[PDB]
Amino acid sequence: SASCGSGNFNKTAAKGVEFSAVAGDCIKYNKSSGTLQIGSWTGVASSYNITSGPQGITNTGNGWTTVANAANGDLYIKIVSASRSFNVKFDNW
């Protein structure tokens, strides 16, 4: 109940497809290959914890954050902080 995961994620992200996100969101993302990338251009700093994965991921709101150690498969990504809603995309390459 305390872990962002298959039973409580509220949004699903599609590869390269931007969506509006807010602090508290728990996002399902499936990475087939390559390296996870988190991109945003709203100018809002955001931070992410991946369940059973890298934590303390930060994006400052003007480009892509590379997340080198995220596993392939279904990832559950909690948005831990964001001062306001912001457009983000999850990608991998």
This PDB structure is determined at a resolution in Å of 1.7
For 26, which DSSP code? Answer: E
Q: How was this structure determined?
A: X-ray
- C-alpha pair distances (Å), 64 with each of 2, 10, 35, 87, 92: 28, 23, 12, 12, 11
Asked if residue 51 lies in contact with residue 1, where contact means CB atoms within 8 angstroms, the answer is no
Contacts by residues 20-24 (CB-CB < 8 Å, ≥ 24 positions apart): 20/85, 20/86, 20/87, 20/88, 21/46, 21/79, 21/82, 21/85, 21/86, 21/87, 21/88, 22/79, 22/82, 22/84, 22/85, 22/86, 23/79, 23/80, 23/81, 23/82, 24/78, 24/79
